[PDB]
Amino acid sequence: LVHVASVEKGRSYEDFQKVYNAIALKLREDDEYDNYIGYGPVLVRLAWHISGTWDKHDNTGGSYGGTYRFKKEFNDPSNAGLQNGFKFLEPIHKEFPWISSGDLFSLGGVTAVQEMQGPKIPWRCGRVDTPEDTTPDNGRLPDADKDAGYVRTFFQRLNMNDREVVALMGAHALGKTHLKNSGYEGGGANNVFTNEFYLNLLNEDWKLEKNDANNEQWDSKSGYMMLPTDYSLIQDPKYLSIVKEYANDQDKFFKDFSKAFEKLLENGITFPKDAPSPFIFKTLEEQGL
Ligand code: HEM
Ligand SMILES: CNc1nc2ccccc2[nH]1
């Protein structure tokens, strides 16, 4: 299956910077969401879930088609809670209806990362909405109750290696779990993008416990938590080395995350040779806005 990036007609960098800015300004405005976390974390998660349906073997799923807008995918139990990010983006789409759904969802994640003081993530336009029958079945997003071998095998379907997996999981510094969404009991929450995930894994005192939904999770006396799949990154020796690398080098984490996240968001897409180069958007802070 071949999906060729097609630039929304007549649009260029400045058009997408205005979309970025509208997203970033709403992130600042609607600051009360989720006990003052704001929408940054759920938007990152949304961009990952719309991309993480991809299958390298046949190029089904992926961000290209914008299929999260369809009920089969919108109601995937793995996507419980992402409707909040969808609702956030609705007024942005109403204002800028020329943008494709896939480009909007993916740009939401890029904007959220950068506004939360994370790395710059180059981003490319040209995702094209595809029909309802191209929506992938539920069950392609990962389970949380598994070990390192599961995580490694899982991410091979997304063409991700050990370093890319460990770097992408650092997004779990952001936001929190919610029992009613996923059956995991949240710990301390944050809306600033840092390498704290790896520091916490290494430095905290963890105890395996069973939460009120009967699921196992690792809890620290300081009030943080880790899913079994998070904790697997210090149980496996190859993952552990990389966790230590990122805990000790903020800049290296930022660079590796940026590459892996752009790749995730672009998997499945064929970019023509005359396609525009990737866009690097300015933050509101950089613009004096
Ligand atoms: C093995 C891989 C992964 C598993 C099993 C996993 C599972 C989870 C679970 C169970 C939650 C809690 C959801 C809730 O209760 O609201 C969560 C939250 C989150 N995940 Fe992951 N995840 C994985 C990988 C990733 C990746 C690769 C990214 C991004 C690069 C990411 C970004 C997030 C964000 C930003 C949140 C917080 C959402 C919020 O605060 O609303 N996750 N994830
Ligand atoms: C500290 N915030 C946080 N920890 C998580 C673990 C798993 C999923 C999301 C998370 N957000």
Numbering used by the authors: 4 to 292
Paper lines:
Another type of cavity, the W191G mutant of Cytochrome c Peroxidase (CcP) is dominated by ion-pair interactions with Asp235. We turned to a mutant of the CcP W191G cavity where the substitution Pro190→Gly has been made and residues Gly192 and Ala193 have been deleted (P190G/W191G/Δ192-3). These residues do not themselves directly interact with ligands but form a capping loop that seals off the original W191G cavity; their deletion opens this cavity to solvent. The closed (W191G) and opened Gateless (P190G/W191G/Δ192-3) cavities in Cytochrome c Peroxidase conserve most features that dominate ligand recognition – the opening of the cavity only deletes residues that are distal to the recognition features of the site, and the crucial cation-recognizing Asp235 is conserved in both (Asp233 in Gateless).
In the docking pose, the ligand contacted Gly178 and Met228 via the benzimidazole nitrogens. In the crystal structure, 22 rotated away from Met228 to interact with Leu177 and Gly178 via one benzimidazole nitrogen and the methylamine tail. The second benzimidazole nitrogen hydrogen-bonded with two ordered waters; these water molecules were not modeled in the docking. Compound 22 interacts with two ordered waters that were not modeled in the docking and the ligand is rotated as compared to the dock pose. Third, structures where we observed a substantial discrepancy between the predicted and experimental ligand poses saw the intervention of new ordered water molecules that we had not anticipated in the docking model. Part of the effects of opening the cavity to bulk solvent appears to be qualitatively captured by a continuum-based electrostatic model in docking, though the role of ordered waters is not, and their effects can be considerable.
